[PDB]
């Protein structure tokens, strides 16, 4: 571990400095350096570690994208596809290490709901971003299920239906649905249900936790306005 | 690719 | 060299798809791995090659800038200090990388105008990348203004004063001046003669290279207005 | 910091 020599709360302090530098590499070294510390993650400590690889992950996505749209006119040289897949490989290794990191040690140790539904989530979102690039492509897409799955039972047990951490695991596993598992009827029918529960919610809560809950709210609507 | 929303930063 | 064993127009071609991909860390990688193949570069390799490096030392600019501002406020723990200098000393890394490129041995196989001009110009600019964060920051800044002295010495002599290489350099040393070297009636003055004598030439050329010439000319406006 | 316009991608 290239941060072992670090200490946490620096690591933590440096992740805080990449992101309003707009380093995500650096960001994400530093939250992996500070999940193997060993210690449990508080809530902000957890949101570092997402936004870091959101962004990593989300740059080779969208590169990897782009080559395949090339390499699939291109067979309508090698270096077309030689480069996609040194770009997948890159992608596949970062979702690898964020999986790591879940399954060594943070879910194990993850007893409330909202850390263990935020890492199952988690689980669930870097298993989807292999299958986007799969072609055990089965197995990979049943990984990603039965984690979303997990987080979504657990969700329903201990949290009300406008929980941010809820609403953002529903979103996400609509849209697995919709374009990974190829069920779109499943997709809306997540989507919907969740809005209208979430809906019918929102009148217990304070203004800042409204403003929280209504910013998902609006993904799950702008989704189904594409889907319907 | 038409990508739908997803949580968080949207990165890609 | 990591591009060793890849053939020149392989690492070109991808050099092209990566920059498709805006990835450009790696079009960096490829043009390197171009270069150290010991051949001159054509025009286009050229351009791929200094976009491919702006890029990636225009991440760590920005970057270096947000810590440095951050560090300056703290000044009015180590941590910020020390995340800075490791951004700083990547950004010297790479200026450094560009800077061996051109004299080992871009610069002195260059012996057209506007590969000569297109180098030394190149090595301007990193050198003034290294000037921006040196606090040598002396000898850093002459190396910066003997290298725009040459490129500016054989473009005037070789080069009509609305081509694009020309403007450029003059742009860039232009802002050497204002911002590098504290003279700002230096700038000053280059930025209007540039102007002005690319105005009085633009009537020789075809709509295309028009198109070309004004862009920079826009960009010397642009300064001017700020500055004057 | 104010950035003046210099040649070629605004890349910072
Ligand atoms: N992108 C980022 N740096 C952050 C994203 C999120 C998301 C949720 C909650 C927090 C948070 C929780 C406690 C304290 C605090 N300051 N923030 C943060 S922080
Ligand atoms: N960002 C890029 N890829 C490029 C930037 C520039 C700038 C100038 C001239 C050329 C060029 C010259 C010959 C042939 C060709 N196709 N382009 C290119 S290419
Ligand atoms: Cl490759
Ligand atoms: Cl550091
Ligand atoms: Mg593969
Ligand atoms: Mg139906
Ligand atoms: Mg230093
Ligand atoms: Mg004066």
Redesign the pocket.
């Given at each position: 571990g290239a941060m072992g020599s670090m200490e946490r709360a620096s690591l933590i302090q440096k992740?805080?400095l990449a992101?309003q530098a707009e380093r995500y590499e650096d960001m994400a070294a530093f939250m992996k350096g500070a999940v193997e510390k060993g210690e449990e993650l508080?809530?902000?400590e957890?949101?570092?570690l997402?936004?870091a690889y959101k962004n990593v992950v989300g740059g080779q996505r969208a590169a990897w994208r782009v080559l395949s749209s090339i390499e699939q006119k291109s067979n309508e040289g090698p270096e077309v596809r030689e480069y996609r897949e040194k770009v997948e490989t890159e992608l596949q290794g970062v979702c690898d290490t964020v999986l790591g990191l879940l399954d060594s040690h943070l879910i194990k140790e993850a007893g409330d709901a909202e850390s263990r539904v935020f890492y199952l989530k988690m689980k669930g979102d870097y298993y989807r971003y292999l299958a986007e690039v799969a072609t055990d492509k089965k197995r990979i897409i049943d990984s990603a299920r039965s984690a979303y799955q997990e987080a979504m039972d657990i969700s329903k047990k201990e949290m009300p239906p406008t929980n941010?951490i809820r609403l953002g695991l529903a979103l996400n596993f609509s849209v697995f649905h919709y374009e990974i598992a190829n069920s779109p009827e499943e997709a809306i029918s997540l989507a919907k249900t969740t809005f209208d529960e979430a809906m019918a919610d929102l009148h217990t809560l304070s203004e800042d936790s409204y403003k929280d809950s209504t910013l998902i709210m609006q993904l799950l609507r702008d989704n189904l306005t594409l889907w319907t | 690719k038409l990508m739908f929303k997803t949580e968080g930063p949207d990165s890609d």
């Amino acid at each position: 571990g290239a941060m072992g020599s670090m200490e946490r709360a620096s690591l933590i302090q440096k992740a805080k400095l990449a992101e309003q530098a707009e380093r995500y590499e650096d960001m994400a070294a530093f939250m992996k350096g500070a999940v193997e510390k060993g210690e449990e993650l508080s809530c902000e400590e957890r949101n570092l570690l997402s936004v870091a690889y959101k962004n990593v992950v989300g740059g080779q996505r969208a590169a990897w994208r782009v080559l395949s749209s090339i390499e699939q006119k291109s067979n309508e040289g090698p270096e077309v596809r030689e480069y996609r897949e040194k770009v997948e490989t890159e992608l596949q290794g970062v979702c690898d290490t964020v999986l790591g990191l879940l399954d060594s040690h943070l879910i194990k140790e993850a007893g409330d709901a909202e850390s263990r539904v935020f890492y199952l989530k988690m689980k669930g979102d870097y298993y989807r971003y292999l299958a986007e690039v799969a072609t055990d492509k089965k197995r990979i897409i049943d990984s990603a299920r039965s984690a979303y799955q997990e987080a979504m039972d657990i969700s329903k047990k201990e949290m009300p239906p406008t929980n941010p951490i809820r609403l953002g695991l529903a979103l996400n596993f609509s849209v697995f649905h919709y374009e990974i598992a190829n069920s779109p009827e499943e997709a809306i029918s997540l989507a919907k249900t969740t809005f209208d529960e979430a809906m019918a919610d929102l009148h217990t809560l304070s203004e800042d936790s409204y403003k929280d809950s209504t910013l998902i709210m609006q993904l799950l609507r702008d989704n189904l306005t594409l889907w319907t | 690719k038409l990508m739908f929303k997803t949580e968080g930063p949207d990165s890609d």
